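Q: Okay, next protein. This is Dolichyl-diphosphooligosaccharide-protein glycosyltransferase subunit OST6 from Saccharomyces cerevisiae. I've checked the sequence twice, so it should be correct. Can you predict the 3D structure?
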Amino acid sequence: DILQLKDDTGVITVTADNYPLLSRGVPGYFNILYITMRGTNSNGMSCQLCHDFEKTYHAVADVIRSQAPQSLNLFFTVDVNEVPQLVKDLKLQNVPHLVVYPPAESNKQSQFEWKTSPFYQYSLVPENAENTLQFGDFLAKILNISITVPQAF
């Protein structure tokens, strides 16, 4: 049922409704979680970084979905204005974040939670908002795959 939540871009949107379930993970699957903010903040200010990496996020997702079909990974996106519980649980203080949860150890499955499970974090800064190569390499190393991201020469 979880796998079928993927939109046409192959990305699953976290909601306040499905979050309690999704945060419990899927056995064997990595969780790639983009934590963002697509609207304005309370101050009425946009998040240019969120918007920029969003496109980088999807490009790399598409590449991996196409070149690593066997790969046990799930791509998620959560907006901090839409899922306040995830914001509290994850003690979020800013955006955007990109974190990757490895699958829980089988013997420790029932104790898996986005909130308490260790994760890799890809450092998001304006300097790499659009570097699909570097982000691609990041995931390829974690997922143990070899990919080629379109970037010309």
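A: Here is a summary of the prediction. The helical segments are 19-22, 48-67, 84-89, 132-143. The chain has one domain: 1-153.
Q: Noted. On to the next one.
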